[PDB]
Amino acid sequence: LLIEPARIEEEELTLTILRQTGGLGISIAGGKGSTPYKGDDEGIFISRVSEEGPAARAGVRVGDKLLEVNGVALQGAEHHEAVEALRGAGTAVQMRVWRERM
């Protein structure tokens, strides 16, 4: 009779990425009109993270669903709309992400 202990199933975080120069150290996948990264979800997902890049230093993990970037919601966004938002984000990139337990 081992009772299941309390466990987090889903998280929504606000992560602030800091890049003085160069990149955010992440790749994104998916978007409206593209093949899904996870099952049927058409949302923008983080497909990889550089270990020596800023995103890893901010807590960004692989599989995080990208919901918002510095005040722009990416719900139902085409892939190139997320792309443009991220490239055009300045030195501080605060994003809202949806995370799921593995």
Added chain:
Amino acid sequence: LQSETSV
């Protein structure tokens, strides 16, 4: 159509 983009 599958896009992946590093930024």
